[PDB]
Amino acid sequence: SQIQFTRHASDVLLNLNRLRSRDILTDVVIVVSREQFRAHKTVLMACSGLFYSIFTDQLKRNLSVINLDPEINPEGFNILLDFMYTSRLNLREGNIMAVMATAMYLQMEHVVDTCRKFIKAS
Amino acid sequence: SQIQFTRHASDVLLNLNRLRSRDILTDVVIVVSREQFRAHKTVLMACSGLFYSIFTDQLKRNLSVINLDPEINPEGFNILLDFMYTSRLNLREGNIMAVMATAMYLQMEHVVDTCRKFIKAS
Ligand SMILES: Cn1cnc2c(c(-c3ccc(O)c(C#N)c3)cn2CC(=O)Nc2ccncc2Cl)c1=O
Ligand SMILES: Cn1cnc2c(c(-c3ccc(O)c(C#N)c3)cn2CC(=O)Nc2ccncc2Cl)c1=O
């Protein structure tokens, strides 16, 4: 019987993104080939099967640096990181294969399915 | 022109709450009279003018314990903490004055306004 605040979750996510943009309480750097992306591990865990499985393990929970597989496309990763923090996916013909492969690796099922739909609708 | 994922923010918030429930990557304990509540500072900052102002300051950013004002009602605080992590506000006649006073202190304007509406609709 709770009062539902329909914009609250999106307001929270927006504010988490503004914290990321100011590097406030970020606790990990994700290294992808020659690039580095700082983030909150809690957001990564909340959005990715791969990052959940990594940080839930007490062996790895306190890691401050994660190196992704050398084959991962940095643009694809950046698109997905932005998606995590915004709910918006920048999917185009020039990046769709890279985004889909990256989302498979990150274990983000809704985005992989959306990539399949994009391929089908094209 | 981004594809919008309408359930993503609520999915993220739900997963942040499950992390809280397992005490995974919580970095602060909020002490309210005789009670203690663990939380993520990033979520607190994202939801509260008071917590934003506290932790944005480098003087206080790394605090692991925050003691709230002794007058703050623990039930009211718990209701608002749950709201932060769920978008659901448990507002009733028996708790409305305590919730409204706590939301004023925490600087959560939408909840204070909702408390005003509850009082008016009653
Ligand atoms: C396949 N797969 C596996 N794991 C996933 C996801 C997503 C997800 C969330 C929103 C999305 O928009 C998309 C997309 N696209 C994907 C998140 N997680 C991690 C997870 O469940 N964490 C968790 C579990 C239990 N308690 C606490 C926590 Cl933090 C996923 O898709
Ligand atoms: C009055 N007031 C002041 N500050 C507030 C809020 C809310 C808020 C959010 C969702 C809600 O559902 C409710 C309610 N009810 C209240 C959050 N914040 C903190 C904030 O803006 N943080 C921030 C600012 C800039 N960059 C990064 C960050 Cl993290 C507020 O209401």
UniProtKB/Swiss-Prot annotation, chains A, B:
Coiled coil location: none
The record's account of how the chain is modified after translation: Phosphorylated by ATM in response to genotoxic stress. Phosphorylation induces its degradation by ubiquitin/proteasome pathway.
Signal sequence, renumbered to the chain: none
Effect of residue 15 to K: Abolishes interaction with NCOR2 and HDAC2, no effect on interaction with CTBP1 and transcriptional autoinhibition
Induction per the UniProt record: Down-regulated during maturation of dendritic cells by selective stimuli such as bacterial lipopolysaccharides (LPS), CD40LG and zymosan. Protein levels decreases upon genotoxic stress in a dose- and time-dependent way.
Domain annotation BTB: ranges: 26-93
Tissue: Expressed in germinal center T- and B-cells and in primary immature dendritic cells.
Compartments reported by the entry: Nucleus
Purpose of the protein: Transcriptional repressor mainly required for germinal center (GC) formation and antibody affinity maturation which has different mechanisms of action specific to the lineage and biological functions. Forms complexes with different corepressors and histone deacetylases to repress the transcriptional expression of different subsets of target genes. Represses its target genes by binding directly to the DNA sequence 5'-TTCCTAGAA-3' (BCL6-binding site) or indirectly by repressing the transcriptional activity of transcription factors.
Domain notes: The BTB domain mediates homodimerization. Its dimer interface mediates peptide binding such as to corepressors BCOR and NCOR2. Interaction with corepressors through the BTB domain is needed to facilitate the rapid proliferation and survival of GC B-cells but is not involved in the T(FH) formation and BCL6-mediated suppression of T(H)2 and T(H)17 differentiationrequired for GC formation.
Subunit (UniProt): Homodimer. Interacts (via BTB domain) with the corepressors BCOR, NCOR1 and SMRT/NCOR2; the interactions are direct. Forms preferably ternary complexes with BCOR and SMRT/NCOR2 on target gene promoters but, on enhancer elements, interacts with SMRT/NCOR2 and HDAC3 to repress proximal gene expression. Interacts with histone deacetylases HDAC2, HDAC5 and HDAC9 (via the catalytic domain). Interacts with ZBTB7 and BCL6B. Interacts with SCF(FBXO11) complex; the interaction is independent of phosphorylation and promotes ubiquitination.
Noted disease: Chromosomal aberrations involving BCL6 are a cause of B-cell non-Hodgkin lymphomas (B-cell NHL), including diffuse large B-cell lymphoma and follicular lymphoma. Approximately 40% of diffuse large B-cell lymphomas and 5 to 10% of follicular lymphomas are associated with chromosomal translocations that deregulate expression of BCL6 by juxtaposing heterologous promoters to the BCL6 coding domain. Translocation t(3;14)(q27;q32). Translocation t(3;22)(q27;q11) with immunoglobulin gene regions. Translocation t(3;7)(q27;p12) with IKZF1 gene 5'non-coding region.
Name of this protein: B-cell lymphoma 6 protein
Organism name: Homo sapiens
Part of the full-length chain shown: 7 to 128 of 706
